[PDB]
Write a protein that binds this ligand. Sequence first.
Ligand code: ADP
Lengths: 60, 43, 459, 123, 577, 193
Amino acid sequence: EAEAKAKALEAQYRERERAETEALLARYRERAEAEAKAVREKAMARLDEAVALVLKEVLP
Amino acid sequence: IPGIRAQIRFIQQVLEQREREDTFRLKRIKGKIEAREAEEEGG
Amino acid sequence: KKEYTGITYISGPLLFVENAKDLAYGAIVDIKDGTGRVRGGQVIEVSEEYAVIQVFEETTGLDLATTSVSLVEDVARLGVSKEMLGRRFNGIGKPIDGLPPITPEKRLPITGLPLNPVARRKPEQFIQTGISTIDVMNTLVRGQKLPIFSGSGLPANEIAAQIARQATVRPDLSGEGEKEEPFAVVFAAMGITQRELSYFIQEFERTGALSRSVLFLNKADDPTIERILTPRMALTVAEYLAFEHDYHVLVILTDMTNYCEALREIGAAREEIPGRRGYPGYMYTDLATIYERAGVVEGKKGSVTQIPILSMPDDDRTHPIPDLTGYITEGQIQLSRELHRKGIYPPIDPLPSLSRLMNNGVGKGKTREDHKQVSDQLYSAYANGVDIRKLVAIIGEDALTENDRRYLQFADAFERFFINQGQQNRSIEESLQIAWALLSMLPQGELKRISKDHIGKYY
Amino acid sequence: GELLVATARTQARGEVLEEVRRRVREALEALPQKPEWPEVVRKLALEALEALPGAKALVANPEDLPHLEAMARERGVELQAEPRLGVRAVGAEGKTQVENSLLARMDRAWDAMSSKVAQALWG
Amino acid sequence: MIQGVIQKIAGPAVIAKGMLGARMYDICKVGEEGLVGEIIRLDGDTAFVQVYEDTSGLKVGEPVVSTGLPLAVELGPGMLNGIYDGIQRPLERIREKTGIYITRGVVVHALDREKKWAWTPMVKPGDEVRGGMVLGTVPEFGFTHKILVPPDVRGRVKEVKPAGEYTVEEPVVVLEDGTELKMYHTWPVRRARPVQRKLDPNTPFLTGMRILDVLFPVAMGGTAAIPGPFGSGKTVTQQSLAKWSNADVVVYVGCGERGNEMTDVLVEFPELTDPKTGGPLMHRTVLIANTSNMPVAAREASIYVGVTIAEYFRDQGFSVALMADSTSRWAEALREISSRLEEMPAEEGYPPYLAARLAAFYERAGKVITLGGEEGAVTIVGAVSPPGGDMSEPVTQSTLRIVGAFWRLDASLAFRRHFPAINWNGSYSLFTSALDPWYRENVAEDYPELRDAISELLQREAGLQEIVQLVGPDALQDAERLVIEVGRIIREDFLQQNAYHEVDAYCSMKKAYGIMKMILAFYKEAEAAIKRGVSIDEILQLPVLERIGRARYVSEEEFPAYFEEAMKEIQGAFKAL
Amino acid sequence: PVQRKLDPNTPFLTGMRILDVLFPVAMGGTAAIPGPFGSGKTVTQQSLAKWSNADVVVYVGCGERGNEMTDVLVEFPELTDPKTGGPLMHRTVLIANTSNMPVAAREASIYVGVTIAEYFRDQGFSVALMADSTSRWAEALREISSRLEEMPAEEGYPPYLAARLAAFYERAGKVITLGGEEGAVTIVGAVSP
Ligand SMILES: Nc1ncnc2c1ncn2[C@@H]1O[C@H](COP(=O)(O)OP(=O)(O)O)[C@@H](O)[C@H]1O
C-alpha cells in the first residue's frame, strides 16, 4: 500500500502537470500574439517618419 | 616486447622519409609554374 | 560599388579579376555577372594588377563577357547584438532563427587578439555541470579549457547538448549568490547530419532552453570555407558577452577535426607549404590563439568556461590534432566504446580522464573541503578494484580475500551506479552523497584516501 | 513562455521595419519620372563621375539620361546608352566600370543602420 | 554556343578558341567523333577542354563549340528495365548499331520518342499547375509511373489531351503560357531537386539479412559505407541486398565495373524473381552500368545520374535503393586530372577537391518528404575500395559523420565459410536508435532487447580473448568456454548467411527473433547447469545445439514450430542431464 | 666578450641540499631536468632561486599557458629573498611568452635573457638561467622553418638543429669579464617532456 497510494499520486501528478503546463502555453501564446502587435502599434504612428528619413539618404 | 617495439620504430621513419619527396617533387613543379606564370602584375 | 571585370582565368575556386591596388587584405566582394549571380569569394592574395578571389560556387550561368564587382565590403565581419539571443545560426550566421536581423550595438571583427598577459588570473572558481563524475573526478571551474576526447561512432555529441541543457552556472555553496552571474550558453556545431540537426532543435527548442543560448553551425553540405570562420564568430562574440558584459560562459565546440580537415582543402590548392601530416604549422598557432580566452581578467568574474570538443580517430594523441590540444589545454576527458556499450552515462574513462586545474574552486565548504580526498578516494578505490575485475577467470571471488572481493564489488557498484546516471540531472551535493554510500560498502578498514573523520560524517 | 513572447515581438518589429524599407525602395522606383527628377539625375550621375578617374561616357536609362544635360555637356559629352535606379560610369579601359545604384545606396543605408533606423521607429 | 575549333593542339584537354563568355562546366559539341567537352578552366577565349571520348586524331582546328548549358538526364518513361550507359545511352540501341563491341559516336536516344505510350488527362485548362503535379499515366509494370509537372517547368494549363498512347516528347498539356508539358525531361545532373521539407528515418530499411538488419539494422532513408578490400569481399557481398530490399525502386548502378560481373547483374536481373512482383528484378530496376574501360568522366556520370533519378523518384515518393560500387576509382578519375592539369593535389596524389566532391552530394537525401508530398527514401549504399587497404584513407575521415553505417572486411575470415565475418567494432551504425520505437511495436518490445542481449557477450568476450591469447582454456573459471562456444553459433547459423544456402537465402525479423530465443534458452539452461555445478562438456555434447545448428537450415516459415520444439529439446538435453 | 671564460668549478649553491650534493652544478654550464605535468615542478624553480646563489634571476615562457604565464609574476614577491630581506623580485628581470604570441616573439624570447645575462654577467653578476619548455620553444622554430622553401627534410625538425642550441650553452662559465669580474651563468635545460 505504500506503492498503491503513490500510484494514486502519480495520476494527478501527470494530469495536473499536463493541464497546467499546457494551460501556461495558452496564456503565453495568446499574449505573444498581442505583444507582437503592440510593438507594431508603437511604430505605426511614427513610421512614416522612418520612410521619409530613409528616403532622404538615398535620394540625391 | 622490445622486438615488437622495434617494429613500429622501423615502420614510422620509413613511412616518414618518403614524405620528403612528396613535397620535393611537387615543389619543383610549383617553381616552374610560378616562375613562368607569376608575372601578371608586370603584365 | 567598384566594378571590375577583367576576369581572366577561372580555375577551380580561384579567380582573377583585374585591379588590386585599392584593396585591403581579408576582403570580399560580390561578383555578379550577366545573371548577376552571387557566388561570394574572399579576396585573397592581392597581387597588384589582379587579385585572387577564392569563391565558393560553381561558375555556371556565368559569363566572362559580363563580370564586375559590386564592391561589397572588404573587411566585412559581424555587427553584434548581445541581446539578440533567440538566434540560431548556420555557419557564419544568417538567421536559422529566421528572426529579423540584429541591431549592431557594436561591430566586431572576428579577430582582435585575445586578452592581455597581465589580464589573466589563475583559476579559483568551480562551476557545477549537472553531471556528477565530471565534477568529481575532474572538476569544472571557470576559465578552464577541458578537452573532451571523443572517438568515432559515439554519442559524444549527445552528452554535449545534453549536459549543456542541464548546466546552470553555480558557486552558491562558496558563500556567494548566483543572481549576478549571467549564464551564456553559446553553441556551435559543424558538419551536421539531418538526424543530428534535429536533436539540436529538440534540446533548445524542447522548451525555451534557447532562453540563454545561440546556435551556429556549418554543415558538411555547407562550404568548408565558411566553416572555418564559423567558430571565430561565437568566439569573438563570446567576449562581447561576458568579458564585455559578464556572463559565465560555455564554449561548446564540435570536432574541430572538421575545421582542419576543411583547412587542408584551402591549402592543398593554394600550394600552402606543408608541415607535418602535410599540414603546415599554424595549426599550432591558431589553436593556441583560440583558447587564450580562458583566465580571469580583472574586473570580470565573467570569464568564459571553455570546452574544446573533438575526437581522435585512432584514439591516441598521435594525431597532431589532440597532441596540439594536449599541450596547451587544461585537461582531458575521454569516452569509451566499451563504456557506451555498457551503457554508462556519462561514459567517461577513469585514469585517462582529468581536469588539470580544479583545487582552486573547490573545497572549503564550496563542495566541502572534503571534495579533494573524495576525489582521490574513489580514484584509487575504484582503480584497485579493476585489478580484481581483471584477474577474475584466473582467480575468482573465492581464491580472493574478502576485501579485494569487495574491491571487485566496489568497482561494480561504482561504474554501474555512479558513473551511469542516464539523463538524471544530479546536483553536485547530491553527487557527493552517492560517493559516501558506495564507499560505505567497503569498510573503513578498506578506506583511507579520505580521513575516517570525514568518512564518518557520511558513512 | 517568455521566449515565445520575446520572439513574437522581435519578429513583429521586423515586419514593420521592412515595410518602411519597401516604401523608400518603392519610392525610389517612382523617382525617375518625377518633375524634380532631371535634377536628381545629374546628382548621381556626378557622384558616379567622381568615382571614375577614367572617363568614357555617362550611362543611364531613359527616364534618366535624356534629362541629364549637365554631364551631357560634361564628361564624355554624351548621354550614351541605357543600363534608372542608379547612375554608373565607364572609363579608363576595362575593370573600371564602377556604379552607384540608388538601390545599392538603399541597401547601404538599410543594411547598416538596421539599428538606428529601428531606433527612429522604436525610440 | 561559343564557337571554336581546336585552337592549340595540346592534349586531350585542349585549348579551343572563340570561347569568351564561357560558362564553366558546360557541355558542348566538339569535334566529329561525336566528341563532347566540358569547360574545365577558362582563359577568356581559349578554353580548357575536358575530354571524355577518345581520339587518335588530335590535330588543330576541330570543333569545340559549347552549348552554354550543362549535362542532363532524360527523366521519364523507359528507364526501368534496359541498361543505360554512363552516357545514359541504352546500350541495347548501341549494341544493335555497333555489335558485340561497343562503338562511340553512336548516339542513341535514351527514351522512346518514337513509341506509343498511354497518357491520361486529369486536370483542367483556364487553371494552372505547379511543379511535381500528376498529369497522366504512361504505364509499365504495376510499378505504374504517372507523369507529373517537372518542376522549374511549372505554369498555367490550356489543354489536357485525351488519354491515349502517345510519344514521350509529345505534349499532352499545353499551357496558357503556350508551354507544353510532355512526358519526359532531360535534366542537369548537377542541379539538386527541392522538396517540401526534409524528412528523416525512424523506420528501418530491411535488406533481408541479419547483420545489418538487426544487429546493425538498416534505416529507411539510410546512408552507409563499406571498405571491401582488393579481391577480398565487397562485390559479391553486395548483390543479394538487391533482391532483398523493400525498395520501391531498385537502382543498380556499378562503376568502373568488371564486364563479366555485369554479365551477372545485367543479364541476370531478368532471371531474377521480383517477390513484390514475380518476373525480372528489372521491373523496378533501371540498370545503369559503366566500366573503367568506359571513360573516367563516365565513371563520374554514372553516379550523378542515379542521383538525379533518385531525386526524380524521391519526389515521386519512390524509395530509392541505390547502391554504389566504390568511388575510389572515381577518386582516381578526378585525381588523374590533377596531374594533367598540372596541379597540386591533396596528399599522395589525392585531388584537392574532395570535401568539395563528396560531401554535399552525399547528404542530398534520405526519406525526405517532397513537393510530391511523398517520402523518397534515398537509400544509397556507399562502397569503397581501400586501395592502399589502409584504415587511414582520407576518404575514410571524410566519411565520418556522413554515413549511417560503416563496415570493414577481414579476408581470411571471409575466405572461410563466413564471408562476411567482420569486426562489428570494425563497423558502426548509430543509425539504429530511432528505430527502437518502431521495432518495439512492430517486431516486438524485446526485439530490440534481444539484440542488446547478444552484444553484451560479444564485446565482453574480448575481455576473455586476450587471456586466451595468454594461455587459452587450460584451467580457467567455468564461465570460460561458455561464452566462447556461444559466440560460435552466433556467427554460424545466426549470421552465416548465403543466398546459395538457399535455406538461408532470406532471413526475417521474427526468424531472427525465433533464434534469439532458441539460443537464449540454451544459454540460460547452461547457466543453471554450471551454477548447479555442471561441466560444460556435456552441454557441448547436446544434439539440440545441432537443432539450433539447423537454424540457417531452418527457413522462416518452418521456424515457428521448428523452434518451438527445440526449446524443449534444450531442456531435455539439459535439465535432465 | 668577457676576455677569458675560465673554470666554472665552484658549484652553484641552491639551498636545497641533496640536489647539489648529489649532482652539483659548477657555475656556468648546461643542465637539464625533465619533469612535466603533475608534481608541480614549479616548486623547484621557486625554492631553488629562493636561496639560489646568483644575484640575478632570469625568467620567460615560450608555450606556457596563460594564467600560469602570469603566475610567475605573482610568485615573485612571494619569494622572499631574505638577502634583500624583501622580494626576490628585486634581483629579477622577467621576460615572458604565452603561446599566442607573435612569431618572432617566441624566437627572441630566449635570446633576450641570454644577451641580457651577459650584460650583468660582464658587470660581475651571477645570473640565473632556468627554463620553461625548452622543447616547446623549438616548436615555433619548426613553424618558422615551415613556411620557407626549406623544410625539416630532417625528420620533422627545423634544419638548424644544433644551431640555436649551440651558442645557447656555449655561452657561460666562470668568466673573467671585460670588467674583470665574473657572472655565474648557470642554465637548466627543462625540455620537460
Ligand atoms: N555471403 C557470402 N558467402 C560466400 N562468399 C561470399 C559471400 N560474400 C562474398 N563472398 C565472396 O566474395 C568473393 C569476391 O569478393 P567480392 O565480394 O566480389 O568483392 P571484392 O571485389 O572486394 O573482392 C567471392 O569469391 C565470394 O566467395
